[PDB]
Every structure is written in structure tokens, then in C-alpha cells.
Ligand binder design. Structure first.
Ligand SMILES: [Zn+2]
Ligand SMILES: [Zn+2]
Ligand SMILES: [Zn+2]
Lengths: 210, 283, 194, 284, 285
């Protein structure tokens, strides 16, 4: 509540300094969104599953909002790969490789344990969140918490990094890890067992126009 | 002398004779009263020992087991022990023979099932032979063990002479905690069984703490013991013993002489020992 | 051309919508001025009549919603129908056709992903300003969305069962897995600082 | 030993094949009798041994056949007309009536035979034993019932659309209504073009060969002219003269092949490809 | 007598000794184009016989692009024939075939630059050359009096045969060197044959589509069909060959060949049937 003000600008500094996206394009740290985006205000932990006690007020906000809007897929390769295609000018490459790959596999194992343990998480949230949409809230919050800790990580690593030329040594295991994520979603049966009809049922397809 | 409860199996009727008897270990004395045969047959573990120096050729040697479950099985397939809540559906006791069923009802204190069983026996030729007194002698054995266990053991160590925490050492392991207390719910017989099946992660002796593994292999469960990692993907189990897939992407290498060359070097066994809990011993 | 069965689907959806749970705010959605020019509703992608409306650049510039590297959850897109067939019972009254329709849609995704590797340039020939880099996936999704829009008219009065068909659900899983796998082949090749 | 239905029947010498393990309800001789086919196999495997050796069959439907003669196996509708069992033995008529569930005709036969002394004196044991045997053979499979004791649900599909027809497909209901052994024999006969492995999908031919009509299984091209069928003519009324026209080769120089004969050769028969198959990752 | 075009090598399998229009050993056909020399037998109701040449597809399923390519375009030839992996003789041969006179003369001077040529190995090398050259010379249909197809035409599309339509692929076939066209006509069995009085459809669908890039193996559509065949991975996927033995019956069942035959293009005979002029003349349309 005392020192964010600098980073508020920092997240936008280099992006406003540059105008040169020519194929690959970023939402500028996505840095413009409603109170939900403004709520991510703490050094949460990426290492572990969320500290459910932290988020009760967030859940009570979410109760004002609908949640049948959420894709299951992480879009791991899709979103992350474009925002990594950049390097130093031929220096500290060891460093860059190390933090990049380590963060990569950290997110990998993070999602792997999320999928392996989603039941315990959603139930431990529901224990005090008896809300009818609590499962969608849990899924959303999982995504959003990951995204926010990622935004903080990005904010922190924000550096010159002008260089841009693919390293296929980096991009090789790209496919292996991303396809393991999608295989995790395949391993998610998504459990059609007589509960999702309580949803808006894909908004009845909105007159087949959405 | 014979001690395996399953070696105590008998038939009330003339047809079946259970002619797959207990392993020799039934005659041995670990205080487990379980043939390793049956251990496999119903639980999928193999018993083992770790010798530990008493800083000397004097030793404390702790019995443990290894789970035999593969990487593919999940949920009920991975359950090793049930709750009394769910032993029935876990096992399909009806497929098991009536002596097995009644013995499990003894384990779970299901007096209602015991009563229904006696009420069915009232007219049976096993009741004409009063062979139910076989069950009552099993009860005598049990009650002796139980007066040696439930009053004793953990309760005795409420004297503080000893304590084991089954709680996960890592506070981050949010799935831990309350199960260590739920431990209290089970029959002390079972509690003894599990606690002597499972190695602690640490031993306190006031000389020094000892740490036996980096990270706990096992986890407490919501109904009964399950073969599961605390977190992450399951570690591989080389269990080593229909048109299905058999694919295994072997490395190409054809060399074999290397193996004969390397027989001189530690052929590291890959079993899954059970590490869980915090152990405390006085002195 | 007419709304026609649009109104019939509207009627059926009204018959299902006995509940509102309204006044909940939709922060997420900004679906400005959706338009439904998709009367060609072709089974296949080749139409220059789709590129006819390449002016989409203009509406993009006003409200972009660019979606790089777009990949689609076929399972989630098709799941709702899985429970609806059982307004009646004890016949494959439509499922006999739904299964093969699912096969066809999956095979479509198998093949158009292959054909994309050259069809981009045909669309640049349709319009040299292109920006096909995104518009190709745009149309790829949109045309099947039109297929679904008409397919719903082909099925009409179907209502949510509570009992799932394990066979149908397994079919959905086993097709969608490969469908998602197909996207793995998407790759980029040394554009430098683009 | 002999599993041929005609082996059950009571000259009509069976082929020896149906004496053997594969449980086909017909010897290969009588597979001619109305069915214009020979049973076949496809050695299939990974890169060693040979693992799966899936059965198939080739028809010998004549290229010049049309209509009924294009139909391979008549539907329960009009099978009686297609076959004209009146041309056939009462045993054969009965059997077909059973397969098609024409229990009404079964009743009519039993009514006829009841008052005959040849029925009571000798033939009743034949009729009843044969009937029971046949029905029991049906029940040996009948995967619709009986634990589905034979095989599984199998994860087979036949009704796959071609890419260009309407959103049609129907008459699997009829497929099911057919005595299940017919379905199982079709499973013997027809490979899918595609098989899902638990982790992989595999394709075996570029294009399908056969169609299912409500009238029956039909050997037809999906489009265009029928392929020429060189029916080998090695195997099968003279009461009345039988006529044919046939366009045939003429020419010399066949010795030219004397050298080329050593090369690899391609058998040219018409296997049946239609449908899809899968293997479950688990029988969930 | 041995007359594989790889007898030039300075070894061919025994089939090379047949004087036959393959003009290749199956050895080298495989080693460079991954196909196996075949004949399709054809029969009548009479049981009279005829035969057509074929060579089943053999290159692996999974690989893509140039891996699908069996024979590149001359415009793209080295992209397969990455000469610098390949022996000089091989390179020279292929250059000649593609009419790459530029490269021809380049190698011509390379002989001098190989200062070991002072040993006059050039005599042997060029004798082998001229040997080869002879073969192409003989293949040339453009030679004035060489005999040509009377009753016969071939096209590489149904419509191109049915109405003489200007197929661009047909044109590029024509633009290929005469030997290449020869080898194609030798190897390629049609989807269709018209006859002076009759037409025959061999399949409802072709095996492969071939394009300007070269001999393309690709299926027209859908997935490729199965094609069965040190710090590396044998990587074998393998299956539950449970051996629920059934050979006791199955030995009698006809075993379908497990191969990818060629059914490619539309042949026409539309004149007095006279085919059995059994000379491997260039026989151009
Ligand atoms: Zn025992
Ligand atoms: Zn027979
Ligand atoms: Zn050769």
C-alpha cells in the first residue's frame, strides 16, 4: 500500500518507449483492467497452491459476476512463447536461459499439480465459499492468481532485452511441455457427471450468436 | 507355532479348503500376524527391513514395506486401506468368503454385521458343530492383542516416553495436517500395523536428530492409506511382475558387454520405501 | 433468405429459459455489434466469397480483439449437446448422425491445419494487404461456427439429460485430444525482431 | 467340430474350414452357396513377428450385376423374395426364418408337420435337435445379451459418413435388429479404414469400398462406374439353357512374361473397407 | 545382360541382367527412390493374362515435405540430391539427366583441377560417361525416326485424358527430359484405362498426387496410410502380440498383400488393339 506507485509506471515504461511490434504483439503487461485486475495487490507465492484464506473478499466480489466465460486451456505455448522471443545482446545468455527455463518448468509443475489436485483445492474453497458458481470461481481464480504472479515476475524482470532471434534450443522443449499441458487437459475428463446443467449451459449459445 | 490370522483360516463347510496357504512367514514372529502372501494378496506391499547402527554393530532395525502399485492406477485403484466408511465397497466383501467378511466386521467393530451373522448361523450346520467358537477363539487372540495394544502402545507413550508424528514435515503440504489426528480414529491394532509399516522421516534422540530422507514418500488419506506421492507426478514404479498397447521407446544401443563390465558396480534397487512422519525417542 | 429457424431456436431457448439469475454484471464481455454475414455456410474453407469482406481490417482497427496463435477447445465447444438428445429415449434419433458429424468436424480440423501451409498465400492473392496471419484462423473458426449455427437448426427440440452417455463422452474425449494435438505443429522461423 | 450351419443341417459337403477354431458359422464351400465371398486375412503388426492378422473377405460380385444382384445380403425386408426359399429345402427355409425371426413361418411349418406321421415317427427328433442346436449357437454369441459374453462393445463404428453426403446415416437400428451373428460376421468381414490406438490413429486405405442400404449390405462404388470384377470363374440351371455374353481377351505373345514372371506381383481382389475402430485407453 | 544404369558405378542386383525398360536394379531403385520393382498381373473371364509395371510406395509415413518427395523437380533437384554428400560420378550422372550442361562443364574442368587426373583416370571415367550417355541417346524419343505410340495415350488426370485438357502437371511432364518421361511412363500404372470399345476403372481413388515440385507421394487428402517396414533411440512402439493362436484355421485364409500399389493416371487405347509390339521403343504419344 506504500510502494507500488513506481512499478505502476515501470510496467508501462519500456512498452511506451517502444512502438516496434512488427509481427508479435503484446498487451502492455495487460496493464489496464477493472477492479479485479486492481485486486492483485500482494506477493503471492508461485511455488504452491493458493492460500485460500487470502481470497475470500475476492470471492465475494466474484459473486457479483458471471463465470461461464472461461476457457479451460492454459494456452501455454500460445501466450507465453511470443512473450519470450527476446534476449540480451549476446551476453549473460547463461543467466537468461537459466531464469527463463526455470520459470518455464516452474509453471509446468505448477499446472501439473493443479490438475492433479483440483478436487482438494475446489472443495477446500467451497468449505467456506458455499456459492453456487464456486467451481467456476475456483478455476478462474487459479488462472488469475497464476497470471498475477506472472505479471509481477514480468514487472521484475523487465529489462532492455532488445535482441530478438529464436534459439531453437529454447524452443525445442517448448512443444514437449506445452503438449504435456494439453495432455493434462485431456487427462481432465471434465467429469460430465450430472452437475454442469446447473450452469447457463453455454448461455444457450446466445441465439447461436456470441 | 502359527500366528498369521489368515493362517488361522478354517471352513465351516466341507467343500472349500483355501488350498493356497500362508507363506512360511506366518510361523515367524514380527508381531505382524500376517503372511506376506496375504500382504500382497490384499494390500499390495512387501515387507522389508532397514538395519541402523546403534553407532555400533549394535543396531536398531526397523521393519518397513514397499508398495507395489503402478503409475497408471488412480483413486480406488491406489487405495491400500479403506475407512470403515468404505471398506465394503472398496473390497466387495460379498465376493470374499463369509469368514473373511465376519473377520473384517470384527476389525470394523460392526456389531450389527456380527449379530446378523450369528443370526444366520443359528440354523446352520456350522452352528450345529458350534464352529463359531473358532471365531470366538480368534476373538480371544484378538482381545489379548488389543489389551496389549489399544490400552498400551501409543497410550502407554502418552507417558511421553515416545512419540511419532505422522504429520508431513513440510508445512507447505496442505493436504497433510488433520489426517495425522484422524489416525486416532482407527483400531489401535491397525494403528500399530501402519506405524510399524511406515518409517519416520526423522528420529529425535537428544544426542542428535537424524534425517532419513529428503522428502516424504507417503501421505495420510481421507479414508485409508493410499499409494500416492505428496505432490507432483507419481514416481516410476518398476514393478517387474489382450491386444493392448505395449509401446516402450527403447534406446537404440546394441552394446551388451558394458553390462558385464559394470556388474562390479552398485546395482541400485529401485523399490519404494515408505517414509513419513516425525519420530521422537527419549534419551 | 430469412431469420426463419432463428425464431424457432429463439422459441425453444425461451422454453428452456424459465430462470434468469440476472443483474449479475458481465464485466468480461464487450461483444460490440456482432454481425452474421455467414450465409454461404460452406463445409470447406476455399471460398473467395469469404475474403470478399476483407474490409474486416477496418473494424479490427476500431476494435481489434486480435488473438495470436488461436487454438480451440472442440470438447468444450461441443459438450453442451451431449446431454440434450434425450428429450426422447431408446433411439439414436439424431445421435446416429451426431457421431458421424463429430467425425467429420474432427477430420476437417485434421486437414485444414495441413492446408493452411499454403492457403494463406491464396488469401493474399485474394487480397495483397492480407494480414492473413490472423484472418486465416479467424475464418477457420468462423466457418465452423456457422456450421454449428445451422446444425442447431437441424436438431432443435433437445433438452438437458442428467444421465451422460459414457460412450459419447469417450468419443468426445478421444477425438478432441487429437484435435488439440494437431495445433502442436504451429511454428515460427527466424523473423528476427518482429 | 464343424461349425457350419449347413454342417448342422442333417449332397451338401462342407468345406473342412468350419471344423476349425475360428468359429465361422459357415464352411467356405457354403460361403459360396448364397454369399459370393471368400474369407481372408491381413497379417498386421509392429516391426516384428506378426501380431494381429485381422480377418477380411473378398466378394466376387460380377461387374455386370445390378439391383438385387448388387445387394450383398438382403434386409429382413424382402429377403424371402431375394432368396426364393421355395427353391430350397424346408430345413433351409426354417433356418432362414429363424435368422430373420420369421417365427410366423416357423409356426406354419410346425403346424404342417404336426399331423404328418413322418414328422412324429422319425423327423421330430431331427427338427427339434437341429432347432435347439442352431438357437444355442446363436446364444453362444448374442452379445446383445448374455454378459455380452463374446468380445466387447468393441468400439467399432460402421456408419461413418463420406465427406460429401448430407448429414445422413441410419439403419444401424436395423443392423442391431438383425440376428447378432450377422453383425458379428460383418465384423469378421469389414476392416475400418481407420483405427484409434489408445494414443494413435492409423489409416489403411485411401477410400471406402462398400455401402449399407436399408435393403442390405451393398457392394457398390460410392460414385461413377463399377470396377471391373474378373470373377475367377473357377467355381459355380441346366434344366433350361443358360446364356451369357462376355467380353474376353484374345492375342498371342504371352511368352513375353516368361522373364518378368520373377518380379513381385500384386493380388487384385476386392477387400471390404468400411468404418472406424478404436482401442480404449481404459474401459472406464 | 546387366544393363542397370548404375552399372556405370566405378553393385547392381542380378535383376539388372534382364534387358527390360526399368534399366535399373531393384537395388538402386530402392537406394535412390525407395520403391520395389513390381508387375501387376491382369486376367480375363477367359483367364487370359496381361501384365502392367508397378513399384509400390516404400518411403516412411511420418516424414514430410522433401521426405515425401521421391523425385524432385529439376528446379529443386539438388535439394534432394545434396551433391556434397554424394560422389562425383553420382553428381555428374544426375546433372546430365537434368541436362545441367553448366554443371557438366564444371565437372569437366574439375577433372583438370583434380591434379591427380594427370594419372589419366579420365580415360576410364569418360569411357563410363560415354557408356551412360549412350543410354540417354537411345531413350531420346525426339530422334527423327524413333517409333511412337500408335494406339496409346497416357495422361495424369482423369479429365486431362477424357477431354485432352491442358494439365499443367502434364505440361511439366512434357518439359521433363525425355528419359524422365520414359521412366515415369514405365513405372506409373493408371487409375483408368479406356479401350477402343471399353473402359476400366481400377480404383475409385488414386494412390498419390504428384506436383510441379516433383514426384510427390502425397495422398490427395486425409492422413497418410500406414507404411510398415550408438546414441540413438530405436524408439519402437510395440503391441500386445498375445499370440492367441489361430493359424490352425487362418493358414487357409487368403492373405491380402500389405502394400501400397500404384493406381495413377488415365490411360487410353482408342485404336485397333495391337499392343503386343513388345519393343521398349520410346513409344511417345
Ligand atoms: Zn496369511
Ligand atoms: Zn458347410
Ligand atoms: Zn544398379
Amino acid at each position: 500500500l506504500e510502494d507500488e506507485d513506481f512499478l505502476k509506471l515501470k510496467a508501462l515504461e519500456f512498452s511506451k518507449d517502444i512502438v516496434n511490434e512488427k509481427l508479435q504483439k503484446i498487451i502492455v503487461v495487460t496493464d489496464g483492467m477493472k477492479r479485479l485486475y486492481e485486486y492483485c495487490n500482494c506477493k503471492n507465492s508461485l511455488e504452491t497452491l493458493p492460500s485460500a484464506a487470502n481470497y475470500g473478499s475476492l470471492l465475494k466480489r466474484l459473486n457479483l459476476y458471471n463465470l461461464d466465460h472461461i476457457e479451460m486451456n492454459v494456452n501455454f505455448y500460445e501466450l507465453l512463447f511470443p512473450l519470450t522471443l527476446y534476449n540480451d545482446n549476446d551476453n549473460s545468455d547463461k543467466t537468461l536461459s537459466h531464469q527463463l527455463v526455470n520459470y518455464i518448468f516452474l509453471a509446468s509443475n505448477y499446472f501439473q499439480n493443479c490438475a492433479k489436485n483440483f478436487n482438494y483445492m475446489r472443495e477446500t474453497f467451497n468449505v467456506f465459499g458455499p456459492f453456487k458458481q464456486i467451481d467456476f470461481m475456483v478455476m478462474f481464480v487459479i488462472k488469475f492468481n497464476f497470471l498475477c504472479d506472472m505479471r509481477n515476475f514480468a514487472k521484475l524482470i523487465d529489462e532492455l532485452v532488445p535482441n530478438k532471434q529464436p534459439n531453437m534450443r529454447i524452443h525445442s522443449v517448448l512443444v514437449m511441455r506445452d503438449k504435456i499441458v494439453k495432455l493434462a487437459f485431456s487427462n481432465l475428463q471434465f467429469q460430465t457427471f450430472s452437475k454442469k446443467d446447473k450452469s447457463r449451459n453455454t448461455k444457450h449459445l446466445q441465439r447461436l450468436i456470441m | 507355532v502359527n500366528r498369521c490370522i489368515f493362517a488361522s483360516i478354517v471352513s465351516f463347510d466341507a467343500c472349500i479348503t483355501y488350498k493356497s496357504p500362508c507363506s512360511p512367514d506366518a510361523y515367524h514372529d514380527d508381531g505382524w500376524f500376517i503372511c506376506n502372501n496375504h500382504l500382497i494378496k490384499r494390500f499390495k506391499m512387501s515387507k522389508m527391513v532397514l538395519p541402523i547402527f546403534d553407532e555400533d554393530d549394535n543396531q536398531f532395525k526397523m521393519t518397513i514395506a514397499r508398495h507395489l502399485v503402478g503409475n497408471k492406477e488412480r483413486g480406488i485403484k491406489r487405495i491400500l486401506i479403506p475407512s470403515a466408511t468404505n471398506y465394503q465397497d472398496v473390497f466387495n466383501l460379498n465376493s470374499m468368503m463369509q469368514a473373511e467378511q465376519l473377520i473384517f466386521h470384527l476389525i470394523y467393530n460392526n456389531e450389527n454385521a456380527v449379530n446378523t451373522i450369528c443370526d444366520n448361523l443359528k440354523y446352520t450346520e456350522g452352528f450345529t458343530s458350534n464352529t463359531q467358537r473358532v471365531i470366538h477363539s480368534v476373538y480371544a487372540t484378538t482381545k489379548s492383542i488389543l489389551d496389549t495394544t489399544n490400552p498400551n502402545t501409543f497410550c502407554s507413550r502418552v507417558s511421553r516416553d515416545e512419540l511419532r508424528f505422522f504429520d508431513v514435515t513440510n508445512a507447505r503440504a496442505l493436504r497433510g495436517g488433520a489426517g495425522d489426528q484422524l489416525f486416532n480414529n482407527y483400531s489401535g491394532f491397525l494403528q500399530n500395523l501402519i506405524r510399524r509399516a511406515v518409517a519416520p522421516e526423522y528420529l529425535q534422540i537428544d544426542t542428535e536428530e537424524l534425517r532419513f530422507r529428503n522428502c516424504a514418500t507417503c501421505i495420510i488419506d481421507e479414508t485409508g492409506l493410499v499409494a500416492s506421492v505428496p505432490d507432483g507426478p507419481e514416481l516410476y514404479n518398476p514393478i517387474r511382475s489382450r491386444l493392448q498397447i505395449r509401446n516402450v521407446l527403447k534406446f537404440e544401443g546394441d552394446t551388451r558387454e558394458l553390462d558385464r563390465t559394470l556388474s562390479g558396480y552398485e546395482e541400485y534397487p529401485t523399490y519404494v520405501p515408505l517414509f513419513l512422519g516425525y519420530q521422537i525417542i527419549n534419551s
